[PDB]
Homo-oligomer: A and B are copies of this chain.
Amino acid sequence: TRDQNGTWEMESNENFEGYMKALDIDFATRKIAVRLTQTLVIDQDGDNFKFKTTSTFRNYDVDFTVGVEFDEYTKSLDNRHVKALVTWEGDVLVCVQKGEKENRGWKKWIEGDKLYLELTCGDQVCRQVFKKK
C-alpha cells in the first residue's frame, strides 16, 4: 500500500501544540493553528511526490443574478439571514443586504488586474484588494 494519492481530511490530531512548541512556534500562532481543520492533498506519480497542506477557517459560497432580490444566509461569517439585492451602478457591483444590521452591503469592481472590494456595516468600511492568481 504505497499509493497515497487523494484528498485527505483530518480526523484526529494528537499532541499538536506540544509538537509546535518543540519547533519554537510562538504562542499566538499555536493557539490559532490548534483551532482550524486540515486538508492534505497528495499527488503521487511513481517516486515523485507533491504535498499541499491547507489550514482553512471558514468557507463561503453564494450564487445570484443582478437585479433579483434574494434571501441569503451569511454562512460562517456571522450566520445571519438577510435579503440581498446586487445591482450595477456603472460597472461597480453593488449589493445591499436587508436585515437586523444597519447599512450593510458591499461594492465590487475591477481596475487593471485587481479586484476592489469594500464591505460596509454601520460606520465601519473594510477595504480589501485582490490579485488574480
Chain A interface (Cβ within 8 Å of chain B)?
A: 1-4, 6-16, 18-25, 28, 31-33, 35-36, 38-40, 42, 47-67, 77-78, 80, 86, 88, 91, 93, 101, 108-111, 114-115, 117, 119-133
Contact = CB atoms under 8 A, between A and B. Distances in A.
Nearest to A115: B8
Contact of A77 (B23, B40, B42, B124): B23
A121 B60 contact: no
Interface centre among A8, A38, A132 (most CB of B within 10 A): A8
Contacts of A49: 62-66, 86, 93
11 contacts: A1-B111, A11-B114, A15-B125, A16-B126, A19-B124, A22-B124, A32-B35, A49-B93, A51-B61, A51-B62, A55-B60
B6 A132 contact: yes
A88 B44 CA distance: 14
Given A40-B115, A66-B47, A130 B25 contact: no
